């Protein structure tokens, strides 16, 4: 098609780039290229782009982005699209400053001399740890190897360049090392209404062990990851996002705080943001 | 005004209730005092005239604040009375009539009429076969035996609805009824039926121009 | 001869049809008397044949009513007594029988003292102006409370058991002695639990895991007590101890006619709805704080040692 | 003036601040038959409430709104007075009579608050009759949306949550839960519902009859046996009577117990409620604010020996049946409203959004 | 004084066509258990010490079946007296034979041999004795009813009865059956007979556990035209008087027709007749002991459930049964020694002993009696009966009302194969 290969090469373009940002870029250029001047026909092309892009990629982050920014642009007839492209550009700018804001709000929560415990590789956790070490903070790091795709080794390699002691641990050894970790920081792949996070398979184990040892469980995520889902148990999550599952759900009961570009939030506040945004 | 009370003065072997026999206070004085005791600042009374107008003249001497005593024809009854006074009533009716020497705390029958939004509520105390349900409040079956050419009538449908019916034989009604406005509508629209006391039995509580309004429930109170 | 046979039968059918005798202490007394009469009125010379016939008749009893575990566990007690006597005399036939009889006699005389023992022990567990909660009816627990009431003032909250509201007569019995008693529906257990100090309840059977089989709804009360961290006390004599384990068994709950739960007069819906009336229910040992017995208080984590002290491990299957 | 109802029976010490009333001893036996102090419709509704003929929260609120329509319709402004203040002043004795017949529910409180707000918002310059029927139309619109449209929206939101071949546990009578299950079965879902009931009201038979009439497979058991059936249950659905500012669920007495046992059994708990039943009030227990029904209802008719027959003749005997209880917000997972699915943490946020803020 | 009873083991009203023709009605297994066994269990549980089993039709079979039963063991506390005669053809004949031979002495339990009940009538019996002691033994019978609803399946329109009683003395003043009647009549002088409150009751299910004085037998011999109980009641109430006892918390019903059979079976499986439940094994048998699982699944011994076979609710499986895989059994009783094929859907079907069902069969609300057989791809509509070693061929779908047997004049089929005529 036209969006499949552009998304693929955007992944190739910037190996240091997220997937939701690539998705919003692809949908922006898709809407800017075809020149769809129709009140109702524009939405058809939009949802076609969204369904195609989360058919190629099974991320909840991509679908959440899609939904929220398609509503944002639709919330903006000839002048409609003329102002909608403006609002899309400024949305892209805000989403770009997202991760820097996230690092520079949450790097102050890591008391130095502590021990970070992290799940598989995530760009937001890496950014906040870079911000912390740039502020002259020394700490030890344990990383889960992320057995399905060995992203723990990748996280350890990326964090070793930051001049910090990183000790990638086994997937099932968090229960052993949880008493040696002062806190847990994990980058959510998607945030459900109640405050839970639909992250990699072992994040739920992380949170359960944290509640078993009262250890703080911190989560960092961009606000374009706020998805309007409410799973009651593991099976209640959409099966498309699970594909041996790949991504499981963690209740807000197990999360202490969320560090988003909208400031530090109680797991209770994300639902407030979502119902203010009205899906 | 919730209720617009009315007292009939026409009888319906021993005693002409309208005029003559008075132990201590005129025969209608007891109904009038019962009414005025519980509110009822306005009262409508129907005056006989087959007496050659010897009733209304002496019933305005009871020192009551204000009452309405409407004259009657040369000869009529109680359903005739209600049809005559229909144009001057606009709300629910509380029908009494002259021969009422009673103790009744009518709060009970009026509460029965209110709570269950009854089409009709009645008062009785121990040849009229009256059958009530287990609670004894709702009127299931009622029939005299002067009416009853055949042995005894009871529908299978009402027994399927209400399985057990408690029956009584020696029940005497106090003629104290609380009529809806639409029951008086039905009465006026059908001059067929006279003798209100006999009009209570064509209640047709069960589904058959006859329902001027849904249910037409009826209720009973049995005194101490 | 045939007197023994017809009495054994009578007892079997009484256990099968209804509850006779009502009190399970009287049931223990009756079954012990019957076991004595069996061991006396049979032509047994070796202890093995006696143990075998005892096991057979105990199997018949257990098949009569599985939910009534007192009979079975006391049969196991008699078997352990026989084993102990045989070990004493072998580690001797008439002396064997008479020694078994005097062992049964001491078991019986200590059987009627468990009530008084628990009643005496009751005082050191209740303080003034305390709020007790109990569910259903239990002779042991009401004796406990009315013995503590002679020297202490306290409040008892009795949760009636639906459908069999035995808790009402328990509340009346407690009020007889001036024990300020509040009666409530079992639905209000968690609502009132926040203002309760202790939970004291009887039981029908204590399992080897420490869990106990008690009247339905008591598991919810135990969960509420655990949520509010209030101590849950079980005043159960040592003849309700059953060596069987929770899920190695069969026929745990006793289901009675659903007429108790939903009446016949409801009509046609009774052909479309499935009604269930479990009398007993399972309470795991994690929700019990302390067991009170005729010997003294014990944690649920010692009931297995009490088993080892009462029942031979090869007789747990009968 | 309306006399005060005598508090029947012996109250539990912890509930001495709440009133306890008897169903037999009503309140209208000291009132004029052609009632003048209290409007006929209002005394009618109070008598219906006291006898227990109107039970459901939605039913109570709707009956209240209809009685209020009948009142304002028959209301006439006295000379040299304005409707705005006179009507809201005259409505207070009626509300006091109601709360004396039976304590007001959260839905009733919110409805009366909204009605007073609308009445005070009626223009001074406006005439009488169009103001009256404007109030009537506003009440019609309010009840219409907040009841039927809220019910339809919540039914759709719950239908997109119920899956095929799952066991749902319900407690007591609730119009919203019954409608949700009926609509889910009609739409195509194939499930079975376990109905849990409790003494003495036995209101579960209502939803049981409703489900059987709708054809849904149903099972029935009383609340003590809930621990036995929850292993089979896939989900717990409940109907809230009130949702407080802290997210706690103020509903029938057996709701918090069921939520606790379900949490113990890893069964997610869902509560269905509308926004008009949200209350800025808050409580932490069933003791600060509750309602005590007639204790004579506890007496069980076990054939020939009613044990609690003469319970008043026993000095140290107390009877108590609580009508409400509170579930802490951490024992509940979902709250399904017009706005969709929300956590109990987000109840006060919805309150703010519905405060025209 | 001791308590006797009369057990009419022959339902003289010829109803079960042709199920009675093969074995007597009282021997029909309700749930792997004969009805007479249920009646004997009830009689020995309520406290009867001596019964009189009057068997007329197929008397040899009934006697042979009862002699091996528990109630004929020397250790049994309930003594039975099987009585033999091809002459009497009615309940009235049985009772006049009783008074001629002078069996009963006082307050004997009159009951048929096809009653399922658990009522403890000690209360009713002492009420009857008190009434007879106070009022000069003029009360001759106490009819025992159960509180019901007009909508309950166990109240069939054939046996539906309406009574007019005295709410004070509970004496029965009027009694009749409402079979096919949209109109009920109650004579005037009912109110003259008892002046302190007449009450009409239609919620009463007739348990047929009438406990009667010997005067009842004297009357039955004083009126030769009296044939059955209903006629006796009608003839006595129009002219000694009859009284009543109403039960609320105990079950009772007689299996008159197939509808009553199905209703009572469904009630028994769902423990409405506790303690008379399949798990209890009230009869001291070896092949009739089951393990009551959840949802009233009485999974017996060696039933050999298939892979994925589903037992939804209220399912009884006789021992020695064999069930294929991917089956769906719901609210159905399966007799002992039955083979079920694969993908078989059974709904409210009472498969008796020896029934063999091939794969793909869809049976709903049917009744396959002993040794019945159905071939592959066979569908049965509700209220269809197969009887005594009859075979239904493949690719056949029976209509709703279809009785198949080996008796031509008594079925829609004959000795030929069920494949085609
Ligand atoms: O009156 C009652 C009855 O309680 C109930 C009755 C019925 C129900 Cl439904 C629920 C509870 N209970 C008492 C129990 C002592 C308490 N507290 C005190 O008397 C003082 O408590 C103290 C004082 C000092 C210390 Cl260090 C600790 C507690 C008052 C209430």
Residue numbers in the entry:
A (entry chain G): 4 to 79, 86 to 252, 270 to 305
B (entry chain J): 1 to 12, 21 to 134, 155 to 236, 239 to 243, 296 to 306
C (entry chain C): 8 to 98, 125 to 351
D (entry chain F): 166 to 522
E (entry chain B): 41 to 279, 285 to 466
Q: What does the literature reporting this entry say, word for word?
A:
The integrated stress response (ISR) is a conserved eukaryotic stress response that senses and integrates diverse stressors and responds by reprogramming translation. Loading is catalyzed by the guanine nucleotide exchange factor (GEF) eIF2B, a large decameric and twofold symmetric enzyme that is composed of two copies each of five different subunits, eIF2Bα, β, δ, γ, and ε. The eIF2B decamer is built from two eIF2Bβδγε tetramers and one eIF2Bα2 homodimer. Upon ISR activation in response to a variety of stress conditions, eIF2 becomes phosphorylated, converting it from eIF2B’s substrate into an eIF2B inhibitor.
ISRIB’s mechanistic target is eIF2B to which it binds in a binding groove that centrally bridges the symmetry interface between eIF2Bβδγε tetramers. As such, it acts as a ‘molecular staple’, promoting assembly of two eIF2Bβδγε tetramers into an enzymatically active eIF2B(βδγε)2 octamer. (A) The distal portion of the original model eIF2Bα from the ISRIB-bound eIF2B decamer placed within EMDB:7443 after lowpass filtering to 3.0 Å resolution. There is a helix (amino acids 44–56) out of place. The average CC value for the chains belonging to eIF2Bα from this model is ~0.74. (B) After manual adjustments in Coot and re-refinement in phenix.real_space_refine, this short helix is placed inside the cryo-electron microscopy (EM) density with an average CC value for the chains belonging to eIF2Bα of ~0.77. Closer inspection revealed that ISRIB slightly draws the decamer's two halves together by comparison with the apostate but does not induce marked changes in eIF2B’s overall conformation. In the apo versus the ISRIB-bound state, eIF2Bδ L179 shifts slightly into the pocket, occupying a position where it would clash with ISRIB binding, and eIF2Bβ H188 (a key ISRIB interactor) adopts a different rotamer. Overall, however, we conclude that ISRIB binding to the eIF2B decamer correlates with slight rearrangements that are primarily confined to the ISRIB binding pocket. The A-State also contains a properly sized ISRIB binding pocket, thus rendering eIF2 and ISRIB binding synergistic.
